[PDB]
Write a protein that binds this DNA or RNA. Structure first.
Lengths: 97, 181, 76, 164, 155, 86
RNA sequence: AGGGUGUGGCUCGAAAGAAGUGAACCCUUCCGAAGGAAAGGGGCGCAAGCCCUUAGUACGAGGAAGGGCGAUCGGGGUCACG
RNA sequence: AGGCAGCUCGCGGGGUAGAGUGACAGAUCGGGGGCUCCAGGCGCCUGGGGCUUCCGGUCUAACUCCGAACCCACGAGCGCCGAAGAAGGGGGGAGUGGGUCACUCGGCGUAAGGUUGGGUGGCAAAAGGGGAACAACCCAGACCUGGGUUAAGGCCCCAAAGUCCCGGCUAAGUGCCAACGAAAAGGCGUCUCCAGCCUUAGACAGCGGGAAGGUGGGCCCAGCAGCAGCCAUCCUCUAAGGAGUGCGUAACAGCUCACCCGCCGAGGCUGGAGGCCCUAAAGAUUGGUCGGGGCUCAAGCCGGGCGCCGAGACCCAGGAGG
RNA sequence: UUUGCUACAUCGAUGUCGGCUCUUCCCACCCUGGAGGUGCAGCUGCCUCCAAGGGUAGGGCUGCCCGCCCGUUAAAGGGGAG
């Protein structure tokens, strides 16, 4: 039985959040800091926020700030031997290291 | 366990001479004399003391120690016959037909049983005397084994009663044994 | 001759019982090296116990006039 | 069906009733016998040795045989108590379709060969897990030994006893 | 834990898992009966652990090192313009330690820095000298302390 | 016979046929022997019972005697030189 | 069963291949790869053996010189046995 | 002129193994306390019904308050390849889309040389040595000739080398089998090891006696005169005895059981586990085995050990080709 | 021994049920031999064990197999060998 390729398929706990941080977006402190080109970021999807949700296929990875469009940022990530760009709102980005 | 060094002695009774050689034992006594071989006592050394029997061995197993005592019992039994006579007893009980037995040299014959016209026979080992007085059979001899196997041979012959009949306690049977004489 | 005292651990499915009918033995030997072989010799084959799970705990010498067993005693 | 058919494990557990319709009712209904809360002294338990699954059918039979042996011994309410530990949470499933459909040229063979619920088992996952146990006084351990042991005669797997 | 470490490969290069086959290649252990020396560190430690079931490694001694080095031949030399020259004297050093080394113009003074793959000889009397399977842990494959020194002395 | 006081000859090992004297028993099949002034010098050590051959000659000694003691005892029997009598 | 293979036996060998300007065959001397002894000596181990020495020595795959002998070898066919 | 099939460090991601269920969702066993209703019996008690609380236990692929090993991202470092033989870009030409098996973690199904997944390895297209022969099992990647050393395995003969050593065990030819070939139970048959209880203030066993009496108490019972159906129980007593065990008997009677004494001077007895072995254990395909021969203080097994043979793998020498 | 699945082998054929004749095998023994227990007075029983050397029919209905039955016999054993 082939599984449906739903955009959130097979995520029964990928988008589950530890109960200690439920509710509306707590971490305003992370968002307020601004990125510039060449910065390195880590993607951590917030299941609560329905805006600009990146696909699960690139979660928990290393990202590079290559530019800015609108309220959101675009991020370059290597997955295989190719290149890809992920345009995302900042509320799933945490600085590296 | 492991029996380390077990030693036993046999005090040879008087009026007896004992000869030992080539791991072959012979005992002479007033009642009689029989030669008994003991070449099969591997792992056991036999010392013939001038006035007793010295038996020693080192580090015997569970098997050997039973063997050693087993050897011991026969030798004194060998001694016992040469001094005191072995007298097995065979008592005969019959229900409907009286039982008759006669001696034939080294062979025994019994007939007039519960109705069968056939003959029954048993073998007697050489050098063994067996007689009948009445209602009882006397088995004489020095060697303890010789009489019993001879006595048993009679017992097998008279066992034939046991086919598809509940046993009628009829035939030749062992009574007692070993009068002091 | 320096009788020896051996008390060691050997296992299949937790066969530890530091007392006297499922765990350990006595030994008569000259030195430790000859003595240590004997426990390997017996327990190795007498009960299918590899030297893997052999763990000697205490090895020492007892004095020749006090051993609870007489069978080991009289053999001198 | 023979007990050798379900001794080992064939796949994961099988537990969710709401996901698995129509489970045949297990044979076992009573799990505790004797005067619980009664005063007992000997504390013997029962231990298993190898892994596996035990059909409830045998267990219920094991339940009955244990009771009668004790019941004839002293009484049923007397100074003893029998409690079986495990429960038939696990469920077995068998492709029975080869019986009915296996003689009418219907979809026979391994075709659609998912199992069908016919029985339940008390699952064993730990080496040396409790199965049942009995509590008595000092004066009746001797009757309790075989009492567990006779029950163990019917269990599919090798068992062990102890004294406490 | 000392700086000077070495390794010998005893297994062939067939039936070699993808994990490891290139590691010895990355460890320049193209095929069994080969060696070289490394500065010990946690970074090296990973390979030896991962390749343990195929090789034998440990800490050298002076006796082993001097014996080990003395084997470089017509086709077993330093990275002196390739050519694997036969060292055979300070002469090859004297004209060619002036490239990467500094101050090492003595045959004895090679106790610091680096080397290349070397083609070994079979262990004398059988690698199964007292062993029979080459796959016992603590005895056969991996780390053997100073004992690797005698093991190579047999080589 | 195999008991203390017996003089035997080694079978295997580097000895391979020199004198030896039992001094004490040890186990099932190890015993204590020594050679007082054996022409090579027999080391006072354990020996497997299978690795000696019992000859006829004997010595009268006390259990666990020292090498000098047997070195001294062989004169009583004269075996100081009579080792090679058989 | 078959063929290739080693040792042989018996056979054909005019030319076409070697070869009397030396084949084939014997010695003697020399060099020597890796590799690699033994007797004896001493010591150790219950033993089975090892350790240093004898020694990388004798030995050795390969290659060089001399001599003595004196004409077939290489080659083809079959067969015996491995 | 960097590149990255590995590792280390740093820095992140994770809900799986496991574990818990009073942390949700369910599943599920019992007891205790209190409240409530009903039935029965004499306001009380008993049983049953519902509710609550407390205490205890049993499970979860579609439960997760937690949660590894582990795997993955990126940076730096190590390490390796690189201008003799070169990150990226372009271009010509293909075959390949039925795999299989071994190991390992799954699912389905009991199962399957079944099928269907994850990872690795051959094989396919991989000779050479062993496993008896052999696609896949282990060793190990064949330019050639020659020499030597070695691997997996083996070393009584076939057939190269050990009738090699120590210690111990097996009596069935059990066995002499990695990939393959017997379950539960029974065995004090044997061989070693843990407990517990009596033992020179005389142990077990063995051999004779006292081994008993009001009383054979007895209840109903002709009689049960322990032992017909329920059961108590005192001194005459002491180095010894019950108001008493099994045979028994219509009822007895009687023989014994329980206890001491006389000899007795070494251990004895009961639960425990293991190794090997016996039963369990029965198929012919036609005919008897571990390969056979044959092997039994082993030519088996276990603990170990010691020494060798063994290929084309490796070393060397000579030639050859890219 | 059938019967369920497996598709590894056979689709440029391994010719398919039964029966007839004929040979052989196996033992989980039907009888015959040996031994025993029995709720075995004896016969008849019932059951266990060993034992495959030999034997183990003739008919009716049914094409069979199976099955039902007739009258004797020691019984009228069951399976294999494509």
């Amino acid at each position: 039985v082939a599984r449906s390729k739903g955009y959130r398929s097979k995520t029964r706990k990928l988008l589950e959040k530890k109960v200690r941080e439920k509710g509306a977006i707590p971490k305003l402190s992370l968002l307020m800091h601004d990125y510039s080109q060449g910065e390195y970021v880590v993607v951590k999807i917030n299941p609560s926020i329905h805006k600009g949700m990146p696909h699960r296929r690139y979660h928990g990875k290393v990202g590079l700030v290559v530019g800015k469009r609108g309220k959101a940022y675009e991020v370059k990530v290597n997955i295989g031997d190719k290149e890809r760009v992920l345009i995302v709102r900042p509320e799933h980005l945490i600085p590296f290291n | 366990l492991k029996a380390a060094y077990i030693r036993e002695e046999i005090q040879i009774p008087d009026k007896v001479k004992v000869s030992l050689e080539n791991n072959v034992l012979k005992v002479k006594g007033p009642k009689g004399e029989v030669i008994k071989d003991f070449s099969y006592a591997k792992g056991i050394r036999i010392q013939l003391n001038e006035g007793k029997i010295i038996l020693e061995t080192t580090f015997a197993d569970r098997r050997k120690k039973a063997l050693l005592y087993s050897i011991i019992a026969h030798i004194k039994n060998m001694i016992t016959g040469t001094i005191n006579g072995y007298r097995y007893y065979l008592k005969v009980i019959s229900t409907h037909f009286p039982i008759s037995v006669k001696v034939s040299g080294d062979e025994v014959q019994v007939s007039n049983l519960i109705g069968e016209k056939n003959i029954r026979r048993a073998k007697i080992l050489p050098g063994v005397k067996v007689t009948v007085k009445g209602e009882d059979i006397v088995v004489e001899g020095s060697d303890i084994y010789n009489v019993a196997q001879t006595a048993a041979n009679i017992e097998s012959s008279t066992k034939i009663v046991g086919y598809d009949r509940r046993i009628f306690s009829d035939g030749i049977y062992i009574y007692k044994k070993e009068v002091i004489g | 001759v320096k009788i020896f005292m051996v008390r060691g651990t050997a296992i299949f499915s937790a066969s530890r019982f530091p007392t006297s009918q499922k765990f350990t033995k006595y030994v008569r030997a000259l030195n430790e090296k000859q003595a240590i072989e004997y426990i390997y010799s017996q327990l190795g084959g007498k009960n299918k116990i590899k030297r893997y799970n052999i763990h000697i705990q205490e090895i020492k010498e007892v004095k020749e006039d006090e051993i609870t067993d007489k069978t080991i005693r009289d053999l001198a | 069906r023979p007990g050798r058919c379900y001794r080992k494990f064939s796949g994961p557990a099988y537990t969710r009733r709401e996901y698995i319709p129509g489970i045949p009712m297990p044979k076992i209904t009573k799990f505790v016998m004797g005067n619980v809360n009664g005063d007992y002294d000997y504390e013997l338990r029962l231990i298993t040795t190898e892994k596996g699954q035990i059909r409830h059918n045998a267990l219920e039979a094991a339940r009955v045989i244990a009771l009668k042996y004790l019941s004839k011994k002293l009484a049923s309410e007397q100074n003893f108590a029998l409690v079986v530990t495990k429960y038939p949470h696990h469920v077995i499933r068998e492709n029975k379709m080869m019986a009915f459909a296996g003689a009418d040229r219907l979809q026979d063979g391994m075709r659609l060969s998912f199992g069908k619920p016919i029985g339940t088992a008390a699952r064993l996952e730990k080496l040396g897990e409790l199965v049942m146990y009995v509590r008595v006084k000092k004066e009746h351990l001797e009757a309790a030994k075989e009492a567990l042991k006779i029950a163990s005669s019917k269990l599919p797997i090798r068992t062990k006893i102890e004294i406490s | 834990m000392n700086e000077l470490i070495g390794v010998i490969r005893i297994r062939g290069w067939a039936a070699t898992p993808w994990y490891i086959q290139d590691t010895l290649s990355m460890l320049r252990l193209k095929n069994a009966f080969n060696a070289m020396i490394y500065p010990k560190d946690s970074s090296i430690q990973g390979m030896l652990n991962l390749v343990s079931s195929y090789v034998t490694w440990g800490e050298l001694n002076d006796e082993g090192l001097r014996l080990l080095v003395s084997k470089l031949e017509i086709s077993r030399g330093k990275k002196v313009n390739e050519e694997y020259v036969k060292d055979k004297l300070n002469v090859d050093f004297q004209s060619f330690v002036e490239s990467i080394k500094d101050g090492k113009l003595r045959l004895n003074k090679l106790d610091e820095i680096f080397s290349l793959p070397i083609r070994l000889h079979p262990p004398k009397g059988g690698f199964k000298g007292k062993v029979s399977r080459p796959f016992r842990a603590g005895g056969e494959f991996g780390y053997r302390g100073d004992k690797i020194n005698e093991l190579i002395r047999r080589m | 016979a195999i008991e203390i006081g017996r003089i035997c000859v080694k079978t295997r090992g580097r000895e391979a046929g020199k004198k030896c004297v039992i001094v004490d028993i040890i186990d099932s099949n190890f015993v204590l022997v020594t050679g007082p002034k054996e022409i090579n010098g027999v080391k006072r050590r354990r020996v497997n019972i299978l690795h000696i051959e019992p000859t006829d000659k004997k010595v009268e000694i006390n259990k666990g005697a020292t090498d000098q003691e047997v070195k001294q005892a062989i004169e009583q029997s004269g075996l100081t030189d009579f080792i090679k009598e058989a």
